[PDB]
Amino acid sequence: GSHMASMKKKGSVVIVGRINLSGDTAYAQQTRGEEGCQETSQTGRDKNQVEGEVQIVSTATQTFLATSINGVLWTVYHGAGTRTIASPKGPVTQMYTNVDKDLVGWQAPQGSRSLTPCTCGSSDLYLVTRHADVIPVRRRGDSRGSLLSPRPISYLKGSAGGPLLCPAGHAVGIFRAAVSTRGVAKAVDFIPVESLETTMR
Ligand SMILES: CC[C@@H]1C[C@]1(NC(=O)[C@@H]1C[C@@H]2CN1C(=O)[C@H](C(C)(C)C)NC(=O)OCC(C)(C)CCCCc1cccc3c1CN(C3)C(=O)O2)C(=O)NS(=O)(=O)C1CC1
Ligand SMILES: [Zn+2]
């Protein structure tokens, strides 16, 4: 537009729930409904308590996951773009933005818990989805892993930004894209945790 006075601003990313991994059962919890989400995206002021490692996040148009690792809440650029995140004190600007890696990060919210980067060098992995499914994945390269049991891409949609974990529960990567044939995901592409660690320097 040429009329700057009426140009709009995009809202903030808003935390609307979490994937609870604290007990013996993984389950999704919603912490904010759609009306409250819309309001919070506009103001960027979110006073809700944050807990856990894996957050469910939303914009006005999309919903996906974000994962705390080393004191940074990470997600995908294809979901968040350059948006701020809502926080108790107002919008918080990204501390990391890398379109080439499809990676963004903000300082981790107070109350969150961070995963530790994996140093195990192990190839037996576990992908956590927005529905709290824990999907076994065999690592197949730096940024790929195969599903032991393939799934329609519908099952994975909305889980970009979520973690791949090793057997000990360390972060191995951030889910980025599905490797799909005829709508069936046989594998996943992820941003390796080492790439996050390099971004942090
Ligand atoms: C459905 C579950 C998927 C996790 C998910 N992500 C996606 O939907 C991403 C977003 C977009 C497309 N895509 C794919 O997964 C596609 C697909 C299945 C849609 C057909 N696969 C593909 O292109 O494989 C090709 C392959 C060669 C394997 C790509 C590897 C390179 C990957 C790569 C490297 C560097 C930069 C970029 C990329 C890809 N990238 C930018 C980018 O923007 O990708 C999601 O759930 N998104 S979401 O619904 O949460 C959304 C709201 C956030
Ligand atoms: Zn590990």
Residue numbers in the entry: 980 to 1180
Quote the paper.
The HCV NS3/4A protease – a chymotrypsin-like serine protease – is a prime therapeutic target that cleaves four known sites along the virally encoded polyprotein. The NS3/4A protease also hydrolyzes two human proteins, TRIF and MAVS, which are part of the innate immune system, thereby confounding the innate immune response to viral infection. In this study, we report that four chemically representative protease inhibitors – telaprevir, danoprevir, vaniprevir and MK-5172 – exhibit distinct susceptibilities to the protease variants R155K, A156T and D168A. To elucidate the underlying mechanism by which chemically diverse inhibitors bind to the wild-type protease and drug-resistant variants, crystal structures were determined for 16 inhibitor-protease complexes. These complexes include wild-type protease and resistant variants R155K, D168A and A156T each bound to telaprevir, danoprevir, vaniprevir and MK-5172, with resolutions ranging from 1.10–2.50 Å; S139A protease variants were used except for telaprevir, which requires covalent bond formation with the serine 139 for efficient binding.
The acylsulfonamide groups of danoprevir, vaniprevir and MK-5172 were also positioned in the oxyanion hole, hydrogen bonding with the same set of backbone amide nitrogens, as observed previously for the TMC435 and danoprevir structures. In wild-type complexes involving macrocyclic inhibitors, R155 adopted a conformation distinct from those observed in telaprevir and substrate complexes to allow binding of the extended P2 moieties in the S2 subsite. This R155 conformation is stabilized by hydrogen bond interactions involving D168 and D80. Vaniprevir, with the P2 isoindoline moiety, bound in a conformation similar to danoprevir, making favorable cation-π stacking interactions with R155, despite the P2–P4 macrocycle.
